[PDB]
Amino acid sequence: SELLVNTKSGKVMGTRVPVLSSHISAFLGIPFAEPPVGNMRFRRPEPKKPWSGVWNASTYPNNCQQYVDEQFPGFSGSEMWNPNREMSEDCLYLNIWVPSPRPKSTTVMVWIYGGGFYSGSSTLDVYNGKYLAYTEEVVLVSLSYRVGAFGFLALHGSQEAPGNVGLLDQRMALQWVHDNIQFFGGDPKTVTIFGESAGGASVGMHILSPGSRDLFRRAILQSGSPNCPWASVSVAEGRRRAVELGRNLNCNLNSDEELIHCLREKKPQELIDVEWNVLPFDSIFRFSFVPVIDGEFFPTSLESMLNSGNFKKTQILLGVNKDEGSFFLLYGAPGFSKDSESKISREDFMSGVKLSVPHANDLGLDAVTLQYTDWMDDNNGIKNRDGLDDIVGDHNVICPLMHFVNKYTKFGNGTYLYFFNHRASNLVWPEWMGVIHGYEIEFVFGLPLVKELNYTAEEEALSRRIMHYWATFAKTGNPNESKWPLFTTKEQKFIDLNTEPMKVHQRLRVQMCVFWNQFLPKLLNA
Amino acid sequence: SELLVNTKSGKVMGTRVPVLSSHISAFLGIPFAEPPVGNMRFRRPEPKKPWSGVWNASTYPNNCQQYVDEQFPGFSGSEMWNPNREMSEDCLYLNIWVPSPRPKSTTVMVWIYGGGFYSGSSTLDVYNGKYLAYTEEVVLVSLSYRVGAFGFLALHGSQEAPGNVGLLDQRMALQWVHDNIQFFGGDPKTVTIFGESAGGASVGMHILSPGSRDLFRRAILQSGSPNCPWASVSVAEGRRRAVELGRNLNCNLNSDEELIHCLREKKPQELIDVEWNVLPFDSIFRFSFVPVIDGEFFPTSLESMLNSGNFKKTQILLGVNKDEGSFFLLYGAPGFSKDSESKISREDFMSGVKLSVPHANDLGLDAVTLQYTDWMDDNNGIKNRDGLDDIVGDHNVICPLMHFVNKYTKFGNGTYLYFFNHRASNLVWPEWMGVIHGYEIEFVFGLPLVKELNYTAEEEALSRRIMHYWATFAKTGNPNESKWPLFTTKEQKFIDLNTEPMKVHQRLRVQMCVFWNQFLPKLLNA
Ligand SMILES: *O[C@](O)(c1cccc([N+](C)(C)C)c1)C(F)(F)F
Ligand SMILES: *O[C@](O)(c1cccc([N+](C)(C)C)c1)C(F)(F)F
């Protein structure tokens, strides 16, 4: 029956989920790696030992152990992103939504979620692959990975806790998809990995790491690149933040293995509790345990690789939302509040920019300000609120992406770039926040298709328009069946994505990105 | 008779010059210092020994020895500025245009001409004080000073050739005006010194030098400040450029006096010939023999003085033309030509900016470019032509002036700032050049009043409008009898000066001036 399936690891019993007027089959929580509990914590994942009997794949698996956002309790805007299941170290599971009837072999899309590498869940409402699967006849898969210390603690010298262990979980799920998606109807030759934020930056890491390239065909990255300032740390930094977390729990730091044993004994929440006390600076949009450039997962520095075309050459579809900074400012910058216009004083703006460029020396701070402040209006509540938003977005998402784009277009097999600039009519976040980072996701996964969600018809439209552009690109390497042009180092065309007729622009944030990508760094070495 | 006059130095016989329908009296070429010829070359000026008999003051005196501009022969645009008389070391003379009938005591305006301190003449057509004298019932005086090596050679240690000797000539003429203008009808208590370019920057130097403050009441500075990058050099620099000129003439450089004797023997043109070979860098808008900060004429560095309110506190009227760079680019920058649109390649633009910021290190050059280039149009002939114009103007006239303005408004007794942005209908220079530095002068001196000069009526209007604003300010300390507001460090209001209704703006080139006045210098010390 459509619901019962035989895979190399065993047979799994699925479920038939209703979607819109019809139905679809969902296989939820298929394990793909041995439960990283016990002395296997921090260790790399093992492959799932084959099972006896049918594996009931009808319900969502536990979420990984992580930091829950309590700032705005009851607030949907803040909670849609929170673990909707029992957090547990045994969280390495995978989910698949297959059309009905099940296909012969069709395009597969593996979704990798974001969360600053400190949070994330595959089981959450805005990640329901069903509308996309059903609407575009596609096999949607969502995987899970160890976030935080659990997935990214990095005591390089050791084998008991090397870094990127959580980036390896992504890989091992990609493997299983590769080895078994045929039994579900997917073409293992046409598997597209798409992700957002840390997900989209993870996506770009698999395009880079030699060991992952062969396991997928093409990539979609939304608001994130592996070259982002918050996505990677040196083996060194990873070492220190490792011991810092060590001090915080009163661990014998004298011996790497005694440090590892201590950490391996502490309950999970004890780790999550002080997770943030280890960052080395007062700063916003920066996280604790992130991937390291270890020479294994990454044979070399990312810029070297980017420079020398040392990466999988395929076609990529990458984008960036309009207001990338908001969320981050409203969370860690003094001045921004949910219930107000967050007009900013120049006393706050100055500390805002200190928090955004944590590496900046005085002159660095000085140059950032010269670029972002209106001298015809030194202190303007609004002007500084927005100017700060752009400082965060440009430096943390836009400029790094545009860099990866330009460096990659030279060796890749076709690139498509977009600019999502549309605030959902039903958005629950304050208007000043605008087109918030993370709010295109819902359009991509087709939420506007459900009436009971209160979106305008123009939005149902833009959802179908996007979902297609997406699916169509997965199957083909070109979003086109409008007429989305190709990004080219020469013209640098890109397009807006909103409910208005598709316009084609050029040079996204070129002015500001030469400052961030070329000037600032050159200045900072003096 | 109106024409015969008795002054402390002797009696002078004048002339009656016709002006418009009427007539006026002109006294041309009254000496005010002993002829700086002979071993007095480079020495400071002596006062004119009183004369026997009447001094016939009916014709223009010789012009000082200087560099004649031959680039555009026959071209009016280029020659209106050239010596119209016999150049001669015996050029220390003064001119006075008195109304008819001669007044009791009325406002005096002493005009100090510009020319990068390397050129200038009092006797030239656009400096005819007659229209202004006659129209506003004012006593107009024009003085002369030794330009170039003759007036500014600076071997500090020596008394035989200390610097600023040519700035002392200005002073001694100011003295004579002070001691004798009453016999001509002028109120020695109401004497306004106005100047343009090096003249206007000389004006600001007398506001600064303790020794000059008491000799004049108020100041008008047009396109120049003493704090301009080309207006002053260290005692040191003056020494080296002194010996460089020494090498160039094969002088015994071993002894300061042997160096001075050699120079004092060489004919004048021999000095003018190699005048330019001594500058220490490839650069535009920079001159050879300029005033030095010697501790005498200037008790201290200009910025110290500016900072500590160490300057004559009166009211000043200062301005800046729209296109301040043109002239300089079209003369020393590769790419600009008189007969073409001078669209600039980015290969020329880059050498343009190297020529403008001769002190800039790579990063300096890099920051200047980030600020002045349109990234949405990297190479655009026009864009770069204009962007280069602004680089020159801002860095060489606008920003230094705005700085002096802001620093002075804090201690001064009233400041009025303007922005001349009007291209004369009959302008002979190419249009790209726009509102050229030096082309307001003609409006101030009332040329548009003569029909045979082909100006529009709107221009006759703007000429009378300006001449009044000027005269009225001399007599009162306020240009107002429209409504030109006061410059204030807070509001920073200023107004446009053209044939359209007077508009009041704010913050002239604020954006760019914080880069030039604050950022660039801070960056450059790293
Ligand atoms: O992961 C991001 O895109 C990110 C950070 C924090 C929170 C979210 N979400 C709310 C879950 C979408 C996304 C980051 F860190 F790279 F910006
Ligand atoms: O003296 C200036 O204002 C100047 C320089 C060169 C030529 C002229 N004029 C053509 C005579 C008016 C003016 C300077 F050097 F300060 F910009």
| HEC-encoded secondary structure of B13-68 | ECEEEEECCEEEEEEEEEECECCCCHHHCCCCCCECCCCCCCEECECCCCECCCCC
First to last CA, chain A: 68
CA distances from A21 to A103, A131, A450 (A): 20, 11, 11
Cα separation of A289 and A241, whole Å? Answer: 8
Q: Which atom of ligand 1 is nearest to the CA of A441?
A: 12
Burial of A523 (C-beta count, 10 Å sphere; 0-12/13-18/19+): buried
Q: Indicate yes or no: CB of A370 within 8 angstroms of CB of B506.
A: no
Straight-line distance from the first to the last Cα atom of chain B, in angstroms, rounded to the nearest whole number: 68
**Structure-determination approach:** X-ray
Chains A, B: CB contacts within 8 A come to 39
Q: Could you say which of B511, B522, B526 has the minimum Cβ distance to residue A375?
A: B511
Chain A residues touching B507 at Cβ < 8 A: 375-376
For chain A, how big is the Rg over CA atoms in Å? 22
Is the beta carbon of B223 within 6 A of some atom in ligand 2? yes
Instruction: Identify whether B73 is preceded by a cis peptide bond (ω within 30 of 0).
Output: no
Domain count, chain A: 1
The closest of A93, A95, A94, A96 to A35, measured between CA atoms, is A93
Q: Other CB atoms closer than 10 Å to residue A466's CB: what's the count?
A: 20
User: Ligand 1 atom 6: the closest Cα is on which residue?
Assistant: A115
Q: Which atom of ligand 1 is nearest to the CA of A120?
A: 11
Return the SS3 of A357. coil
| Distance in angstroms (rounded) separating the CA atoms of residues B148 and B65 | 8
Preceding amide of A226 cis, omega within 30: no
CB-based burial label for A240 (10 Å; 0-12, 13-18, 19+): middle
Q: Pick the residue whose CA is nearest to atom 7 on ligand 2.
A: B115
A324 is catalytic: yes
The CA-based dihedral angle spanning residues B288, B291, B293, B298, taken in that order and rounded to the nearest 10 degrees: -170
Pocket test for ligand 2, best of B437, B441, B442, B444 (most atoms within 8 A of CB): B437
Cβ A519–B376 below 8 Å, yes or no?
no
Burial class (CB in 10 A: 0-12, 13-18, 19+), A47: middle
Smallest CA-to-CA distance from B32 within B212, B203, B149, B177 is with B177
The DSSP bridge pattern shows strands A93-98 and A186-196 to be unpaired
User: Residue B30 is encoded by which pair of tokens?
Assistant: 């009254």
Across the interface, which of A366, A507, A511 has its CB nearest the CB of B522? A366
Does A367 sit within 8 Å of B511, measured CB to CB?
no
CA-closest residue to ligand 2 atom 11:
B115
Q: Which atom of ligand 1 is nearest to the CA of A287?
A: 15
Q: Which residue of B has its CA nearest to A491?
A: B376
- The amino acid occupying position B170 is Q
SS3 category, A270: helix
A515 contact residues in B (CB cutoff 8 A):
370
Per the CB < 8 Å rule, is B376 touching A506? yes
Q: What is the DSSP string of B244-286?
A: HHHHHTT---SSHHHHHHHHHHS-HHHHHHTGGGG-SSS-SS-
Ligand 2 pocket residue status of B356, Cβ below 6 Å:
no
| Neighbour count for residue B346 (Cβ, 10 Å) | 15
Cβ contact, residue pair A523, B376, below 8 Å:
no
Residue of A nearest to B505 (CA): A376
Closest residue of A to B365, CA-based? A519
Q: What is the dihedral of CA A496, A497, A501, A504, to 10 degrees?
A: 30
**What residues in A contact B514, CB-CB < 8 Å?**
370, 375
Is B510 close to A376, i.e. CB distance below 8 A?
Answer: yes
> A495: which DSSP letter?
E
* Under 8 Å between Cβ of B162 and B156: yes
Chain breaks in chain B (C to N over 2.5 A) after: 481
Q: Is A291 in the pocket of ligand 1 (CB under 6 A)?
A: no
Domain enclosing residue A426, as ranges: 1-526
Helices (H), A6-129: 76-79
Tokens of B391: 């680089």
Cα(B181)–Cα(B143) distance, integer angstroms: 13
Alpha carbon of B73 to those of A41, B114, B275, B392: distances in Å? 87, 21, 21, 25
**Rounded Cα distance, B212 and B312, in Å:** 9
Do the chains contact at B510 and A375, CB–CB below 8 Å?
yes
**Best to test chain B binding among A370, A380, A398 (most B CBs inside 10 Å):** A370
> Residue A496 in contact with residue A503, Cβ under 8 Å?
yes
Residue A288 C-alpha from the chain's centroid: 16
Q: Whose CA is nearest to atom 17 of ligand 1?
A: A197
Cross-chain Cβ contact B363/A511 below 8 Å: no
Q: How far is CA B502 from CA A307, B419, B499, in A?
A: 56, 11, 8
d(Cα A432, Cα A60) in Å, to the nearest integer?
35
Q: Is the CB of A226 under 6 A from ligand 1?
A: no
Are B220 and B317 in contact, with CB atoms under 8 Å apart? yes
Is residue A197 in contact with ligand 1, taking CB distance under 6 Å?
yes
Burial per residue of B350-381, b for 16 or more beta-carbon CB atoms within 10 angstroms, e otherwise: bebbbbbbeebeebbebbbbbbbbeeeeeebb
Contact B126, B441 (CB under 8 A): yes
Q: Rounded to the nearest whole angstrom, what is the distance from the C-alpha of residue B197 to the centroid of ligand 2?
A: 5
Give the integer Cα–Cα distance in Å for B198 and A488. Answer: 51
Contact B186, B471 (CB under 8 A): no
A437 assigned to active site: yes
CB atoms inside a 10 Å sphere around CB A493: 17
A198 Cβ closer than 6 Å to some ligand 1 atom: yes
Catalytic residue among B25, B356, B437, B440: B437
The CATH number covering residue A314 comes to 3.40.50.1820
Give the CB-side neighbour count of residue B252, counting CA atoms within 13 A: 10
- Neighboring chain A residues of B506 at a CB cutoff of 8 Å: 376
C-alpha to C-alpha distance for A102 and A97, rounded to whole angstroms: 10
Gap between the Cα atoms of B89 and B144, Å rounded: 11
Q: Which residues of B touch A510 (CB under 8 A)?
A: 375-376
Q: Show Cβ contacts of residue B263 under 8 Å, excluding neighbours closer than 6 positions.
A: B41, B42, B149, B153, B161, B245, B246, B249, B251, B271
Q: Residues B344, B347, B348, B351: is their CA dihedral positive or negative? A: positive
Catalytic residue flag (residue A209): no
d(CA A423, CA A429) in angstroms, rounded, equals 10
> Sign (positive/negative) of CA torsion B262, B264, B268, B274?
positive
Inter-chain CB proximity A370 and B514 less than 8 Å: yes
d(CA B116, CA B111): 16
Residues 6+ apart with CB under 8 A from B307: B407
Resolution (A): 2.8
CA distance B507 to B513: 10
For ligand 2, the distance from its centroid to the CA atom of residue B442, given in whole angstroms, is: 14
Under DSSP, is residue B159 helix (H, G, I), strand (E, B) or coil?
A: coil
CB count, 10 Å around CB of B274? Answer: 16
Q: Which residues contact A244 (CB under 8 A, 6 or more apart)?
A: A277, A278
**Secondary structure letter of residue A516 according to DSSP:** I
Catalytically annotated residue among A119, A196, A437, A442: A437
Residues of A with CB under 8 A from a CB of B: 363, 366-367, 370, 375-376, 506-507, 510-511, 514-515, 519, 522-523, 526
Please tell me which residue in B197, B225, B288, B356 is annotated as part of the active site. Answer: B197
| Cβ distance of A375 and B514 shorter than 8 Å | yes
Q: Is A352 in the pocket of ligand 1 (CB under 6 A)?
A: no
A22 CB contacts (<8 Å, ≥6 apart)? A100, A134
CB A243 within 8 A of CB A157: no
**At A306, which helix (H) or strand (E)?**
helix A302-307
**Å from B413 to nearest chain A CA?**
26
